[PDB]
Every structure is written in structure tokens, then in C-alpha cells.
PDB file of C-alpha atoms and ligand atoms in Angstrom:
ATOM      1  CA  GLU P   1     -71.849  99.448  48.960  1.00 17.11           C
ATOM      2  CA  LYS P   2     -70.366 102.806  49.942  1.00 17.54           C
ATOM      3  CA  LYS P   3     -71.359 106.501  49.692  1.00 18.41           C
ATOM      4  CA  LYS P   4     -69.754 109.336  47.700  1.00 17.10           C
ATOM      5  CA  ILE P   5     -68.663 111.990  50.227  1.00 16.98           C
ATOM      6  CA  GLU P   6     -67.837 115.274  48.426  1.00 18.09           C
ATOM      7  CA  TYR P   7     -65.047 117.229  50.199  1.00 19.29           C
ATOM      8  CA  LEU P   8     -63.640 120.489  48.766  1.00 20.55           C
ATOM      9  CA  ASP P   9     -63.779 119.801  44.995  1.00 24.53           C
ATOM     10  CA  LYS P  10     -62.798 116.106  45.513  1.00 23.90           C
ATOM     11  CA  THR P  11     -64.949 112.990  46.000  1.00 24.69           C
ATOM     12  CA  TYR P  12     -64.207 109.895  48.117  1.00 23.12           C
ATOM     13  CA  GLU P  13     -65.781 106.431  48.399  1.00 24.07           C
ATOM     14  CA  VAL P  14     -66.487 105.641  52.070  1.00 24.39           C
ATOM     15  CA  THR P  15     -68.904 103.166  53.675  1.00 25.62           C
ATOM     16  CA  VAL P  16     -70.917 105.519  55.909  1.00 26.02           C
ATOM     17  CA  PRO P  17     -71.976 106.005  58.633  1.00 26.57           C
ATOM     18  CA  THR P  18     -68.774 104.646  60.240  1.00 29.29           C
ATOM     19  CA  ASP P  19     -67.270 104.548  63.733  1.00 32.25           C
ATOM     20  CA  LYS P  20     -64.052 103.115  62.215  1.00 30.82           C
ATOM     21  CA  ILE P  21     -62.209 106.434  61.825  1.00 28.05           C
ATOM     22  CA  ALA P  22     -58.436 106.859  62.176  1.00 27.60           C
ATOM     23  CA  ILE P  23     -57.362 110.472  62.768  1.00 24.17           C
ATOM     24  CA  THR P  24     -53.690 111.316  62.070  1.00 23.49           C
ATOM     25  CA  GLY P  25     -52.089 114.750  61.605  1.00 23.85           C
ATOM     26  CA  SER P  26     -55.485 116.486  61.766  1.00 25.71           C
ATOM     27  CA  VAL P  27     -55.892 117.918  65.250  1.00 28.39           C
ATOM     28  CA  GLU P  28     -58.705 119.901  63.554  1.00 31.17           C
ATOM     29  CA  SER P  29     -60.687 116.647  63.263  1.00 33.28           C
ATOM     30  CA  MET P  30     -60.001 115.854  66.907  1.00 34.18           C
ATOM     31  CA  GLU P  31     -61.687 119.185  67.759  1.00 34.01           C
ATOM     32  CA  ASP P  32     -64.611 118.479  65.441  1.00 34.96           C
ATOM     33  CA  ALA P  33     -65.021 114.956  66.870  1.00 38.65           C
ATOM     34  CA  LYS P  34     -65.143 116.540  70.352  1.00 39.26           C
ATOM     35  CA  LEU P  35     -68.142 118.796  69.657  1.00 39.56           C
ATOM     36  CA  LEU P  36     -69.809 116.116  67.456  1.00 38.18           C
ATOM     37  CA  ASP P  37     -69.323 113.381  70.091  1.00 41.29           C
ATOM     38  CA  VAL P  38     -67.529 111.207  67.555  1.00 43.99           C
ATOM     39  CA  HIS P  39     -65.421 108.535  69.265  1.00 42.68           C
ATOM     40  CA  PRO P  40     -62.850 107.557  66.673  1.00 46.13           C
ATOM     41  CA  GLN P  41     -61.014 104.267  66.393  1.00 47.76           C
ATOM     42  CA  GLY P  42     -57.674 106.035  65.910  1.00 41.92           C
ATOM     43  CA  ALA P  43     -56.748 109.360  67.497  1.00 46.54           C
ATOM     44  CA  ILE P  44     -53.659 111.564  67.780  1.00 48.67           C
ATOM     45  CA  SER P  45     -51.481 111.275  70.876  1.00 49.18           C
ATOM     46  CA  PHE P  46     -49.683 114.276  72.356  1.00 49.20           C
ATOM     47  CA  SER P  47     -46.448 113.199  74.102  1.00 48.62           C
ATOM     48  CA  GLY P  48     -47.836 109.647  74.079  1.00 51.47           C
ATOM     49  CA  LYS P  49     -51.012 110.592  76.005  1.00 49.18           C
ATOM     50  CA  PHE P  50     -54.546 111.935  75.268  1.00 50.10           C
ATOM     51  CA  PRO P  51     -55.081 115.414  76.824  1.00 48.86           C
ATOM     52  CA  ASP P  52     -57.857 115.816  79.422  1.00 51.34           C
ATOM     53  CA  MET P  53     -59.946 117.893  77.030  1.00 52.39           C
ATOM     54  CA  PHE P  54     -60.184 114.925  74.538  1.00 51.86           C
ATOM     55  CA  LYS P  55     -60.669 112.007  77.005  1.00 50.47           C
ATOM     56  CA  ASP P  56     -64.460 111.969  76.536  1.00 51.65           C
ATOM     57  CA  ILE P  57     -63.937 111.067  72.854  1.00 52.08           C
ATOM     58  CA  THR P  58     -60.651 109.051  73.044  1.00 52.22           C
ATOM     59  CA  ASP P  59     -62.216 106.373  75.301  1.00 54.91           C
ATOM     60  CA  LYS P  60     -62.502 103.770  72.472  1.00 56.50           C
ATOM     61  CA  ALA P  61     -59.388 105.017  70.659  1.00 60.75           C
ATOM     62  CA  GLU P  62     -55.821 103.882  70.396  1.00 58.61           C
ATOM     63  CA  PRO P  63     -52.930 106.101  69.145  1.00 57.65           C
ATOM     64  CA  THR P  64     -52.220 106.675  65.471  1.00 57.79           C
ATOM     65  CA  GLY P  65     -48.978 108.245  66.765  1.00 56.00           C
ATOM     66  CA  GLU P  66     -47.863 111.821  67.406  1.00 57.69           C
ATOM     67  CA  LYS P  67     -49.348 114.546  65.165  1.00 58.50           C
ATOM     68  CA  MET P  68     -46.646 114.707  62.502  1.00 58.06           C
ATOM     69  CA  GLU P  69     -45.508 111.072  62.796  1.00 59.25           C
ATOM     70  CA  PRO P  70     -48.243 108.580  61.780  1.00 57.13           C
ATOM     71  CA  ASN P  71     -47.691 104.955  62.880  1.00 59.05           C
ATOM     72  CA  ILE P  72     -48.509 103.005  59.706  1.00 57.81           C
ATOM     73  CA  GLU P  73     -48.167  99.665  61.531  1.00 55.39           C
ATOM     74  CA  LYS P  74     -50.771 100.855  64.046  1.00 53.93           C
ATOM     75  CA  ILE P  75     -53.133 102.312  61.404  1.00 56.72           C
ATOM     76  CA  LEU P  76     -52.947  99.115  59.302  1.00 61.24           C
ATOM     77  CA  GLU P  77     -53.723  97.010  62.415  1.00 62.64           C
ATOM     78  CA  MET P  78     -56.827  99.154  62.974  1.00 59.50           C
ATOM     79  CA  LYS P  79     -58.126  98.585  59.422  1.00 59.29           C
ATOM     80  CA  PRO P  80     -60.223 101.810  59.404  1.00 63.73           C
ATOM     81  CA  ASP P  81     -63.021 102.663  56.953  1.00 65.13           C
ATOM     82  CA  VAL P  82     -61.534 106.139  56.693  1.00 62.61           C
ATOM     83  CA  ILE P  83     -58.324 107.861  57.718  1.00 61.04           C
ATOM     84  CA  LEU P  84     -58.633 111.584  58.398  1.00 58.87           C
ATOM     85  CA  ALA P  85     -55.256 113.088  57.586  1.00 59.27           C
ATOM     86  CA  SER P  86     -53.949 116.648  57.327  1.00 58.96           C
ATOM     87  CA  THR P  87     -53.123 118.893  54.400  1.00 59.30           C
ATOM     88  CA  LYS P  88     -49.850 119.721  56.226  1.00 58.98           C
ATOM     89  CA  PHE P  89     -48.301 116.278  55.567  1.00 62.57           C
ATOM     90  CA  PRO P  90     -45.862 116.047  52.700  1.00 62.54           C
ATOM     91  CA  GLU P  91     -47.407 114.238  49.718  1.00 63.85           C
ATOM     92  CA  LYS P  92     -45.100 111.215  50.164  1.00 61.02           C
ATOM     93  CA  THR P  93     -46.384 110.905  53.744  1.00 60.58           C
ATOM     94  CA  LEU P  94     -50.000 111.170  52.506  1.00 61.81           C
ATOM     95  CA  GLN P  95     -49.406 108.465  49.849  1.00 63.82           C
ATOM     96  CA  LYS P  96     -47.749 106.258  52.512  1.00 65.60           C
ATOM     97  CA  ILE P  97     -50.652 106.800  54.937  1.00 65.91           C
ATOM     98  CA  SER P  98     -53.094 105.893  52.128  1.00 66.56           C
ATOM     99  CA  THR P  99     -51.727 102.324  52.035  1.00 66.93           C
ATOM    100  CA  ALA P 100     -53.743 101.735  55.234  1.00 67.88           C
ATOM    101  CA  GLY P 101     -57.053 102.890  53.659  1.00 64.47           C
ATOM    102  CA  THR P 102     -59.188 105.683  52.164  1.00 62.80           C
ATOM    103  CA  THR P 103     -57.459 108.898  53.184  1.00 59.66           C
ATOM    104  CA  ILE P 104     -58.864 112.413  53.322  1.00 61.66           C
ATOM    105  CA  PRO P 105     -56.418 115.299  53.844  1.00 62.26           C
ATOM    106  CA  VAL P 106     -58.360 117.692  56.112  1.00 62.36           C
ATOM    107  CA  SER P 107     -57.607 121.370  55.456  1.00 61.31           C
ATOM    108  CA  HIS P 108     -55.594 123.424  57.927  1.00 59.18           C
ATOM    109  CA  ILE P 109     -56.831 126.586  56.202  1.00 61.75           C
ATOM    110  CA  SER P 110     -59.154 128.064  58.828  1.00 63.04           C
ATOM    111  CA  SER P 111     -61.770 129.333  56.342  1.00 62.18           C
ATOM    112  CA  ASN P 112     -62.682 125.665  55.615  1.00 60.04           C
ATOM    113  CA  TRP P 113     -63.836 125.138  59.231  1.00 59.25           C
ATOM    114  CA  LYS P 114     -67.430 124.480  58.101  1.00 58.02           C
ATOM    115  CA  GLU P 115     -66.462 121.877  55.457  1.00 56.66           C
ATOM    116  CA  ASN P 116     -64.164 119.953  57.815  1.00 54.99           C
ATOM    117  CA  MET P 117     -66.948 119.803  60.415  1.00 52.51           C
ATOM    118  CA  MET P 118     -69.561 118.629  57.911  1.00 50.05           C
ATOM    119  CA  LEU P 119     -67.158 115.999  56.512  1.00 48.94           C
ATOM    120  CA  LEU P 120     -66.955 114.254  59.899  1.00 50.86           C
ATOM    121  CA  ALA P 121     -70.709 114.792  60.284  1.00 50.31           C
ATOM    122  CA  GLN P 122     -71.320 113.180  56.873  1.00 48.38           C
ATOM    123  CA  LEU P 123     -69.010 110.266  57.724  1.00 47.88           C
ATOM    124  CA  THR P 124     -70.762 109.746  61.098  1.00 49.78           C
ATOM    125  CA  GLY P 125     -74.382 110.617  60.149  1.00 50.57           C
ATOM    126  CA  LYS P 126     -74.539 113.717  62.369  1.00 51.61           C
ATOM    127  CA  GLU P 127     -75.300 116.534  59.908  1.00 50.59           C
ATOM    128  CA  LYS P 128     -78.059 117.901  62.204  1.00 51.07           C
ATOM    129  CA  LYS P 129     -75.660 118.307  65.138  1.00 52.82           C
ATOM    130  CA  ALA P 130     -73.002 119.857  62.838  1.00 52.58           C
ATOM    131  CA  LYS P 131     -75.417 122.406  61.330  1.00 54.35           C
ATOM    132  CA  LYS P 132     -76.634 123.328  64.833  1.00 54.56           C
ATOM    133  CA  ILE P 133     -73.033 123.873  66.022  1.00 53.92           C
ATOM    134  CA  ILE P 134     -72.200 126.043  62.994  1.00 52.29           C
ATOM    135  CA  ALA P 135     -75.384 128.125  63.262  1.00 50.74           C
ATOM    136  CA  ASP P 136     -74.733 128.691  66.986  1.00 48.88           C
ATOM    137  CA  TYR P 137     -71.252 130.061  66.273  1.00 50.29           C
ATOM    138  CA  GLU P 138     -72.652 132.600  63.793  1.00 50.96           C
ATOM    139  CA  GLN P 139     -75.156 133.856  66.379  1.00 49.82           C
ATOM    140  CA  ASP P 140     -72.373 133.900  69.035  1.00 49.67           C
ATOM    141  CA  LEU P 141     -70.305 135.956  66.567  1.00 50.16           C
ATOM    142  CA  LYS P 142     -72.985 138.581  65.715  1.00 51.28           C
ATOM    143  CA  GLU P 143     -73.850 138.933  69.410  1.00 45.90           C
ATOM    144  CA  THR P 144     -70.142 139.241  70.358  1.00 44.75           C
ATOM    145  CA  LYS P 145     -69.315 141.980  67.799  1.00 43.98           C
ATOM    146  CA  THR P 146     -71.784 144.294  69.566  1.00 43.13           C
ATOM    147  CA  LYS P 147     -69.881 143.860  72.865  1.00 46.76           C
ATOM    148  CA  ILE P 148     -66.476 144.876  71.437  1.00 46.00           C
ATOM    149  CA  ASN P 149     -65.535 148.572  71.639  1.00 47.86           C
ATOM    150  CA  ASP P 150     -64.505 150.727  68.642  1.00 47.17           C
ATOM    151  CA  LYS P 151     -60.981 151.435  69.937  1.00 46.45           C
ATOM    152  CA  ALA P 152     -60.278 147.718  70.388  1.00 45.73           C
ATOM    153  CA  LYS P 153     -61.520 147.020  66.846  1.00 48.51           C
ATOM    154  CA  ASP P 154     -59.042 149.563  65.415  1.00 50.60           C
ATOM    155  CA  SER P 155     -56.068 148.302  67.467  1.00 49.98           C
ATOM    156  CA  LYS P 156     -53.045 146.356  66.185  1.00 52.77           C
ATOM    157  CA  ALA P 157     -53.397 142.762  67.384  1.00 52.96           C
ATOM    158  CA  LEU P 158     -51.220 139.702  66.749  1.00 54.61           C
ATOM    159  CA  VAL P 159     -51.459 135.951  67.420  1.00 58.00           C
ATOM    160  CA  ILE P 160     -48.058 134.243  67.886  1.00 59.03           C
ATOM    161  CA  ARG P 161     -47.268 130.552  68.510  1.00 59.26           C
ATOM    162  CA  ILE P 162     -43.928 129.691  70.142  1.00 57.90           C
ATOM    163  CA  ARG P 163     -42.510 126.354  68.818  1.00 56.02           C
ATOM    164  CA  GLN P 164     -39.060 124.928  69.644  1.00 54.40           C
ATOM    165  CA  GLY P 165     -38.322 128.322  71.218  1.00 55.17           C
ATOM    166  CA  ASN P 166     -39.096 130.318  68.046  1.00 54.08           C
ATOM    167  CA  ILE P 167     -41.848 132.807  67.268  1.00 53.48           C
ATOM    168  CA  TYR P 168     -44.261 132.021  64.437  1.00 52.66           C
ATOM    169  CA  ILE P 169     -46.980 134.015  62.718  1.00 53.27           C
ATOM    170  CA  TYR P 170     -49.551 132.765  60.215  1.00 55.12           C
ATOM    171  CA  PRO P 171     -51.524 133.858  57.151  1.00 55.54           C
ATOM    172  CA  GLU P 172     -54.779 135.811  57.452  1.00 57.04           C
ATOM    173  CA  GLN P 173     -57.035 132.735  56.994  1.00 55.16           C
ATOM    174  CA  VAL P 174     -54.905 130.359  59.087  1.00 56.32           C
ATOM    175  CA  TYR P 175     -54.892 129.525  62.796  1.00 54.84           C
ATOM    176  CA  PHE P 176     -56.978 132.007  64.847  1.00 57.27           C
ATOM    177  CA  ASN P 177     -56.397 134.836  62.342  1.00 59.35           C
ATOM    178  CA  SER P 178     -59.649 134.102  60.434  1.00 58.21           C
ATOM    179  CA  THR P 179     -61.441 134.846  63.706  1.00 56.41           C
ATOM    180  CA  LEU P 180     -59.398 137.821  64.892  1.00 56.74           C
ATOM    181  CA  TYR P 181     -59.193 139.595  61.547  1.00 57.24           C
ATOM    182  CA  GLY P 182     -61.956 138.006  59.435  1.00 58.20           C
ATOM    183  CA  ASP P 183     -64.828 137.580  61.911  1.00 59.94           C
ATOM    184  CA  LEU P 184     -64.134 140.409  64.387  1.00 63.73           C
ATOM    185  CA  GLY P 185     -62.898 142.774  61.663  1.00 65.80           C
ATOM    186  CA  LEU P 186     -59.594 143.938  63.194  1.00 70.00           C
ATOM    187  CA  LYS P 187     -57.045 144.991  60.539  1.00 66.87           C
ATOM    188  CA  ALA P 188     -54.584 142.199  59.763  1.00 67.73           C
ATOM    189  CA  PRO P 189     -51.064 143.715  59.819  1.00 70.19           C
ATOM    190  CA  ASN P 190     -48.696 143.666  56.840  1.00 69.87           C
ATOM    191  CA  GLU P 191     -46.447 140.876  58.111  1.00 70.80           C
ATOM    192  CA  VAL P 192     -49.542 138.624  58.427  1.00 74.71           C
ATOM    193  CA  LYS P 193     -50.863 139.695  55.005  1.00 72.85           C
ATOM    194  CA  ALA P 194     -47.473 138.705  53.597  1.00 69.11           C
ATOM    195  CA  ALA P 195     -47.293 135.306  55.338  1.00 70.09           C
ATOM    196  CA  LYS P 196     -47.858 132.408  52.914  1.00 69.40           C
ATOM    197  CA  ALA P 197     -47.528 129.629  55.510  1.00 67.44           C
ATOM    198  CA  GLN P 198     -46.484 129.257  59.129  1.00 68.52           C
ATOM    199  CA  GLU P 199     -43.696 131.808  59.065  1.00 68.68           C
ATOM    200  CA  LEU P 200     -40.832 132.469  61.527  1.00 65.13           C
ATOM    201  CA  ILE P 201     -40.705 136.047  62.908  1.00 66.09           C
ATOM    202  CA  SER P 202     -37.879 137.656  64.877  1.00 66.95           C
ATOM    203  CA  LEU P 203     -38.341 139.556  68.131  1.00 64.02           C
ATOM    204  CA  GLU P 204     -36.418 142.314  66.339  1.00 63.53           C
ATOM    205  CA  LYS P 205     -39.126 142.483  63.637  1.00 61.90           C
ATOM    206  CA  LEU P 206     -41.951 142.252  66.209  1.00 63.70           C
ATOM    207  CA  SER P 207     -40.585 145.352  67.963  1.00 63.45           C
ATOM    208  CA  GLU P 208     -41.068 147.310  64.737  1.00 65.76           C
ATOM    209  CA  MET P 209     -44.601 146.027  64.270  1.00 63.65           C
ATOM    210  CA  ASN P 210     -45.208 147.175  67.848  1.00 61.78           C
ATOM    211  CA  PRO P 211     -48.700 145.626  68.274  1.00 63.96           C
ATOM    212  CA  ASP P 212     -51.244 146.861  70.828  1.00 65.43           C
ATOM    213  CA  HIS P 213     -52.281 143.316  71.793  1.00 65.11           C
ATOM    214  CA  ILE P 214     -50.418 140.012  71.486  1.00 64.18           C
ATOM    215  CA  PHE P 215     -52.012 136.621  72.020  1.00 64.14           C
ATOM    216  CA  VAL P 216     -49.151 134.226  72.824  1.00 66.51           C
ATOM    217  CA  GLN P 217     -49.816 130.471  72.455  1.00 62.69           C
ATOM    218  CA  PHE P 218     -47.263 128.208  74.142  1.00 60.29           C
ATOM    219  CA  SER P 219     -47.225 124.397  74.514  1.00 59.68           C
ATOM    220  CA  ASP P 220     -44.540 122.430  76.422  1.00 58.40           C
ATOM    221  CA  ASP P 221     -45.193 119.470  74.133  1.00 57.44           C
ATOM    222  CA  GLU P 222     -44.022 121.673  71.237  1.00 57.72           C
ATOM    223  CA  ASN P 223     -41.167 123.317  73.236  1.00 56.63           C
ATOM    224  CA  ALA P 224     -39.157 120.357  74.606  1.00 59.29           C
ATOM    225  CA  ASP P 225     -35.975 121.714  72.967  1.00 58.96           C
ATOM    226  CA  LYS P 226     -36.270 124.978  74.977  1.00 60.77           C
ATOM    227  CA  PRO P 227     -38.702 124.867  77.966  1.00 65.67           C
ATOM    228  CA  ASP P 228     -37.824 128.359  79.280  1.00 64.57           C
ATOM    229  CA  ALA P 229     -38.608 130.003  75.910  1.00 64.28           C
ATOM    230  CA  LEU P 230     -41.540 131.979  77.330  1.00 62.45           C
ATOM    231  CA  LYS P 231     -39.687 133.187  80.443  1.00 63.91           C
ATOM    232  CA  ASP P 232     -36.488 134.044  78.484  1.00 62.71           C
ATOM    233  CA  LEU P 233     -38.532 136.122  76.047  1.00 64.02           C
ATOM    234  CA  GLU P 234     -40.126 138.111  78.863  1.00 63.11           C
ATOM    235  CA  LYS P 235     -36.585 138.949  80.026  1.00 61.72           C
ATOM    236  CA  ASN P 236     -35.409 140.081  76.545  1.00 60.96           C
ATOM    237  CA  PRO P 237     -35.038 143.880  76.402  1.00 60.89           C
ATOM    238  CA  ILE P 238     -36.472 143.960  72.858  1.00 61.96           C
ATOM    239  CA  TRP P 239     -39.616 142.159  74.060  1.00 60.84           C
ATOM    240  CA  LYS P 240     -39.828 144.479  77.076  1.00 59.92           C
ATOM    241  CA  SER P 241     -39.825 147.367  74.581  1.00 59.21           C
ATOM    242  CA  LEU P 242     -43.093 146.174  72.978  1.00 58.57           C
ATOM    243  CA  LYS P 243     -46.135 148.422  73.457  1.00 59.89           C
ATOM    244  CA  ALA P 244     -48.267 145.356  74.244  1.00 60.24           C
ATOM    245  CA  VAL P 245     -45.772 144.158  76.881  1.00 62.28           C
ATOM    246  CA  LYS P 246     -45.416 147.486  78.715  1.00 63.26           C
ATOM    247  CA  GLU P 247     -49.203 148.031  78.667  1.00 65.45           C
ATOM    248  CA  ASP P 248     -49.900 144.517  80.059  1.00 68.95           C
ATOM    249  CA  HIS P 249     -51.757 143.496  76.876  1.00 69.16           C
ATOM    250  CA  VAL P 250     -50.046 140.090  76.344  1.00 68.80           C
ATOM    251  CA  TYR P 251     -52.347 137.069  76.764  1.00 69.38           C
ATOM    252  CA  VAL P 252     -50.619 133.740  77.227  1.00 71.53           C
ATOM    253  CA  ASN P 253     -52.755 130.695  76.388  1.00 71.05           C
ATOM    254  CA  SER P 254     -56.058 132.541  76.489  1.00 71.36           C
ATOM    255  CA  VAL P 255     -57.123 129.375  74.616  1.00 71.67           C
ATOM    256  CA  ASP P 256     -55.553 125.938  75.106  1.00 69.97           C
ATOM    257  CA  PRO P 257     -52.211 125.984  73.291  1.00 68.88           C
ATOM    258  CA  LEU P 258     -53.008 122.740  71.354  1.00 70.51           C
ATOM    259  CA  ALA P 259     -56.062 124.491  69.789  1.00 71.99           C
ATOM    260  CA  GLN P 260     -55.652 124.758  66.025  1.00 74.44           C
ATOM    261  CA  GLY P 261     -57.723 127.890  65.315  1.00 75.36           C
ATOM    262  CA  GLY P 262     -59.554 126.645  62.207  1.00 73.62           C
ATOM    263  CA  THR P 263     -62.377 124.702  63.874  1.00 73.43           C
ATOM    264  CA  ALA P 264     -65.800 125.477  65.381  1.00 71.25           C
ATOM    265  CA  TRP P 265     -64.407 124.668  68.818  1.00 74.46           C
ATOM    266  CA  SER P 266     -61.314 126.819  68.360  1.00 70.61           C
ATOM    267  CA  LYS P 267     -63.406 129.697  66.914  1.00 69.97           C
ATOM    268  CA  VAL P 268     -66.003 129.774  69.675  1.00 72.53           C
ATOM    269  CA  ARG P 269     -63.249 129.733  72.362  1.00 75.32           C
ATOM    270  CA  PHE P 270     -61.060 132.341  70.641  1.00 75.08           C
ATOM    271  CA  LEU P 271     -64.030 134.602  70.038  1.00 73.34           C
ATOM    272  CA  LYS P 272     -64.860 134.600  73.750  1.00 75.98           C
ATOM    273  CA  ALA P 273     -61.187 134.966  74.740  1.00 72.87           C
ATOM    274  CA  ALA P 274     -60.523 137.784  72.277  1.00 72.02           C
ATOM    275  CA  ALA P 275     -63.705 139.488  73.546  1.00 72.43           C
ATOM    276  CA  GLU P 276     -62.610 139.206  77.213  1.00 71.23           C
ATOM    277  CA  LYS P 277     -59.061 140.352  76.466  1.00 74.98           C
ATOM    278  CA  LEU P 278     -59.686 143.157  73.940  1.00 76.77           C
ATOM    279  CA  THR P 279     -62.466 144.725  76.078  1.00 75.94           C
ATOM    280  CA  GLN P 280     -60.569 144.104  79.372  1.00 76.29           C
ATOM    281  CA  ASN P 281     -63.592 142.613  81.165  1.00 76.85           C
ATOM    282  CA  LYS P 282     -65.240 139.184  81.371  1.00 80.43           C
ATOM    283  CA  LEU P 283     -68.379 138.872  79.204  1.00 81.82           C
TER     284      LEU P 283
HETATM  285  O1  ECA Y   1     -45.803 117.200  58.103  1.00 83.53           O
HETATM  286  C1  ECA Y   1     -46.015 118.223  58.758  1.00 83.53           C
HETATM  287  N1  ECA Y   1     -45.278 119.336  58.675  1.00 83.53           N
HETATM  288  C2  ECA Y   1     -44.125 119.591  57.771  1.00 83.53           C
HETATM  289  C3  ECA Y   1     -44.052 121.113  57.914  1.00 83.53           C
HETATM  290  C4  ECA Y   1     -43.148 121.674  58.815  1.00 83.53           C
HETATM  291  C5  ECA Y   1     -43.101 123.060  58.980  1.00 83.53           C
HETATM  292  C6  ECA Y   1     -42.151 123.652  60.013  1.00 83.53           C
HETATM  293  N2  ECA Y   1     -42.958 123.330  61.233  1.00 83.53           N
HETATM  294  C7  ECA Y   1     -42.565 123.296  62.510  1.00 83.53           C
HETATM  295  O2  ECA Y   1     -41.425 123.558  62.881  1.00 83.53           O
HETATM  296  C8  ECA Y   1     -43.622 122.798  63.547  1.00 83.53           C
HETATM  297  C9  ECA Y   1     -43.192 122.539  64.850  1.00 83.53           C
HETATM  298  C10 ECA Y   1     -44.073 122.067  65.825  1.00 83.53           C
HETATM  299  C11 ECA Y   1     -45.402 121.817  65.506  1.00 83.53           C
HETATM  300  C12 ECA Y   1     -45.841 122.048  64.201  1.00 83.53           C
HETATM  301  O3  ECA Y   1     -47.132 121.830  63.850  1.00 83.53           O
HETATM  302  C13 ECA Y   1     -44.963 122.533  63.234  1.00 83.53           C
HETATM  303  O4  ECA Y   1     -45.477 122.739  61.999  1.00 83.53           O
HETATM  304  C14 ECA Y   1     -43.995 123.876  58.298  1.00 83.53           C
HETATM  305  C15 ECA Y   1     -44.898 123.315  57.394  1.00 83.53           C
HETATM  306  C16 ECA Y   1     -45.906 124.230  56.699  1.00 83.53           C
HETATM  307  N3  ECA Y   1     -46.913 124.365  57.808  1.00 83.53           N
HETATM  308  C17 ECA Y   1     -47.820 125.345  57.953  1.00 83.53           C
HETATM  309  O5  ECA Y   1     -47.967 126.266  57.144  1.00 83.53           O
HETATM  310  C18 ECA Y   1     -48.698 125.302  59.240  1.00 83.53           C
HETATM  311  C19 ECA Y   1     -49.746 126.225  59.350  1.00 83.53           C
HETATM  312  C20 ECA Y   1     -50.569 126.253  60.481  1.00 83.53           C
HETATM  313  C21 ECA Y   1     -50.345 125.366  61.535  1.00 83.53           C
HETATM  314  C22 ECA Y   1     -49.299 124.451  61.444  1.00 83.53           C
HETATM  315  O6  ECA Y   1     -49.038 123.579  62.457  1.00 83.53           O
HETATM  316  C23 ECA Y   1     -48.481 124.420  60.318  1.00 83.53           C
HETATM  317  O7  ECA Y   1     -47.492 123.490  60.326  1.00 83.53           O
HETATM  318  C24 ECA Y   1     -44.955 121.926  57.224  1.00 83.53           C
HETATM  319  C25 ECA Y   1     -47.224 118.295  59.736  1.00 83.53           C
HETATM  320  C26 ECA Y   1     -48.012 117.156  59.907  1.00 83.53           C
HETATM  321  C27 ECA Y   1     -49.109 117.166  60.767  1.00 83.53           C
HETATM  322  C28 ECA Y   1     -49.449 118.327  61.458  1.00 83.53           C
HETATM  323  C29 ECA Y   1     -48.685 119.477  61.296  1.00 83.53           C
HETATM  324  O8  ECA Y   1     -49.002 120.626  61.976  1.00 83.53           O
HETATM  325  C30 ECA Y   1     -47.584 119.457  60.448  1.00 83.53           C
HETATM  326  O9  ECA Y   1     -46.871 120.602  60.337  1.00 83.53           O
HETATM  327 FE1   FE Y   2     -47.469 122.111  61.862  1.00 81.56          FE
END
């Protein structure tokens, strides 16, 4: 018989505790697995390979495919007890994935970082480890707020992700923004308050926003269509006009560019990075 795992208003029947976990779409769950020492059966590949930072937990895994492109033939062959999917998949892709087994769309909304973590914990029987990781972050946070200067806290700060050579911004509770604005208390700017999903933003618009600090996240595996995007930007006269640029307050990949923002592991890293960068000295 199985157990009833409750996950964000929904309930799922899953035989737990299981090692037979297929992760597709949800890089969030990859990051949770990493801190929980969960070694899934299926894991997400990134350009066909498993990045160094995940190798400790991908040792018993085979690919479910690239992030946005689940391999149903592979996932069926695995016959998992649970498939951890993403809330970013179209519904028709979620229904198609669910032919291979019990499927839980894991939230990409960064304010659900605790629930996502506990879900994997509940599936794997590691609630103690998951509570300890969460508690530790909260202490890390309270301790880190004290180290961050007033000026920095009242500055205009942005997180951008460059994908296929375009600039994207995100809602207030998505990506790292829940840590930059929510946890550290910096004022989210209007364009971010207005964002309802991953939203394209022009350099032209950015130059009006004129942020004090810009965290730029850039992955080659997401920029194959234009690999010079970062260097071409830095040579654009509208980018060179930015306050953040001229004052040397642009931080490229302060956290690994495959980091998703809405996880314990993303939050702890961004919190330390933001702290180092905003206060201009290593903590
Ligand atoms: O099926 C998917 N996407 C269709 C889609 C494409 C788009 C247009 N997306 C892109 O061009 C894109 C390019 C490279 C990598 C991505 O993750 C992209 O979403 C938007 C959106 C809406 N997305 C968001 O709001 C979002 C928020 C935070 C982080 C994200 O990664 C988000 O996608 C959905 C998908 C599946 C797994 C993982 C994903 O990140 C996905 O975007
Ligand atoms: Fe996406």
C-alpha cells in the first residue's frame, strides 16, 4: 500500500519511501536532491551531460532528457514510483509525462521553496534533514541582514537572466527575487512588480530603470543561438550608459547560472553572493 503525500492543496498516492524518482523539468528538485543527498533514478541532463555540481547525486541516474524536453520512452523504461515534473510544462506535456507514472508538478514560484524541499523529503523519508536545512537558512538570513549596510538596502538592484541572447526579468516571488527583495528587504522595482512571468526586457528599457546593482546570470547551454551575447552587450553604448555598469556594480554569475533561485540551495548561495556584492567585501 502507498502513502498520501499532501503537496500544495493537492494529494498524491505514492509508495514511500522511494529511491525510484524520475526528475524532469524541475531543476528545483535537482537542487533539493543535492542538499538532501537523494540519488534519483531519473535526472535532468544539461547539453546531454550532468554538471559537476550534481555528480554526487547523479551517480545512479540516467537522463530523463533536457529540462524542457522529457524523454517519455526513457521515463517509461525506468518505471519510477514518482516523476517530479515542473509547473512550467504546458498541461499537454504534463498529461503526456503522466502516462509514465504518478506525476507531481513542482512549483517554480520561489516562495514555495520550503514545500518543494519537504515533498522530496517526504518521498525519501528525510524530513529531519529537510527541516534542519530550512532552519539553517533562516538563521543564515537573520545573521546576514545585520551585515548589510543601510545604503545597499535602499539601492536599486536587478537580477537578469540572458537566454538565447535576450534579457529576461522575473516576478517578485520568482527566481532569486524572493531572496533579493523578500528576504533582504530591498525595494523591488516597478518593472519587476509588473512582471507576471519570465518577461523579456529591452536594453533600452533597462537604461531608464538605471539600477545601482545588476546581477547578470548567463549560461552557454541556454545561449547556443548567440554565444557572444554577454560580450556584445558590454559593447552596447546603451548598456555602457547604465549606472551599474559605469560604477562597476555588475555581477556576472555570482551564483552558478543553472541555479533556479527558488530552492534552499539557490537561496543560501544567493544570500551570500548578494551580501558579498552589495557590501563590496567578502563576508
Ligand atoms: O515547458 C517549458 N516552458 C514553456 C515556456 C517558455 C517560455 C519562454 N522561455 C524561454 O525562452 C526559455 C529559454 C531557455 C530556458 C528556459 O527555461 C526558458 O523558459 C516561458 C514560459 C513561462 N515561464 C516562466 O515564467 C519561467 C519563470 C522562471 C524560470 C523559468 O525558466 C521560466 O520559464 C514557459 C519549461 C519546461 C521545463 C523547464 C522550464 O524552465 C520551462 O520553461
Ligand atoms: Fe523556463
